């Protein structure tokens, strides 16, 4: 999971690796993203795109227009709007629930 955000001349990102097992939909539960990087940038960006890995093999035709067997992949995009969250903080400090 990642949350890309642009605020006050800073580009920011947040991440978590979850070892969820066998759920097609996003897992029921609570996990909290931890900021990974902060970059100070002025770029204004209207839209974004994703990068795929083409799984090129011997069985494929052998060209850049038709030669590919990419297979399975899945990704979900959700927008972010200003909202107020009451965030519970645990003794350690992990946000256990919100």
In the region spanning residues 27 to 66, those forming contacts with ligand NAG, defined by CB under 6 A, are 44, 46
Q: Which does 32 bind (CB under 5 to 8 A by kind): another protein, ligand NAG, none?
A: another protein
Give the x-and-dash track for 57-86 against another protein (CB under 8 A).
-------xxx-xxxxxxxxxxxxxxxxxxx
CB 67 within 8 A of CB 60: yes
Closest CA to 37 of 17, 12, 16: 12
Q: Binding ligand NAG by CB under 6 A: which of 18, 57, 69, 94?
A: 94
Q: Which does 17 bind (CB under 5 to 8 A by kind): another protein, ligand NAG, none?
A: none
Say how many CA atoms lie within 13 Å of 94 toward its Cβ. 7
∠ CA(53), CA(28), CA(38), 5° rounding? Answer: 55
Contact residues toward ligand NAG (CB under 6 A) are: 44, 46, 92, 94
């Amino acid at each position: 999971e990642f949350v890309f955000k642009n605020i006050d001349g800073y580009f920011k990102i947040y991440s978590k690796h979850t070892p969820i097992n066998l759920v097609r939909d996003l897992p029921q539960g609570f996990s909290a993203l931890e900021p990974l990087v902060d970059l100070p940038i002025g770029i204004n960006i209207t839209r974004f795109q994703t990068l795929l890995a083409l799984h090129r093999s011997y069985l494929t035709p052998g060209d850049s227009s038709s030669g590919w067997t990419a297979g399975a992949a899945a990704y979900y995009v959700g927008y972010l709007q200003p909202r107020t969250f009451l965030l519970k903080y645990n003794e350690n400090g992990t946000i256990t629930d919100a």
